[PDB]
Design a protein around this ligand. Structure first.
Ligand SMILES: [Zn+2]
Ligand SMILES: [Zn+2]
Ligand SMILES: [Zn+2]
Ligand SMILES: [Zn+2]
Lengths: 72, 71
DNA sequence: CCAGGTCAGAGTGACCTG
DNA sequence: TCAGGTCACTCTGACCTG
């Protein structure tokens, strides 16, 4: 049973360099290529799991970057 | 003049409190429908116009602390 | 003025293809 | 293998109706 390194949910394989779920795969794609302005409502250390990963795109993207995800 | 929940421009007194259209609609949906709202922070998230969508749990909390109710 | 109703848009992710 | 495409779904709030 493989686990997403960002939200801890079931992973479907390695995406963009890192073992991730379908959600975090598609999110990282949109986040990097889009012109988004994410701002954490907390302290830039939010819990990112299956239920709360929608809550803070800022911390979700930060975890993607710190885990080493790259489009190429 | 200003929403007591997110600080945005308020449109009037809703459900007991001076709120914007967003926080009005949000509160009704939060108390009637079934929601699994859950804070990813420390239950003290900043609720302003830019970030009010980020944490429904804290947004609902501030609505209740302000005294909003449907009846 | 306020409660209740509504729908189009943004964000999401399950599913498919090669 | 994994990158790219897609679309029905949830949440939201500016706008409408009574
Ligand atoms: Zn994930
Ligand atoms: Zn955060
Ligand atoms: Zn508000
Ligand atoms: Zn919160």
């Amino acid at each position: 049973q493989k686990v997403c390194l960002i939200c801890g949910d079931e992973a479907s394989g390695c995406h963009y360099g890192v073992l991730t779920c379908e959600g975090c795969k598609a999110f990282f794609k949109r986040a990097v290529e889009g012109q988004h302005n994410y701002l954490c409502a907390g302290r830039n250390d939010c819990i990112i799991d299956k239920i709360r990963r929608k809550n803070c795109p800022a911390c979700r993207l930060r975890k993607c970057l710190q885990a080493g995800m790259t489009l190429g």
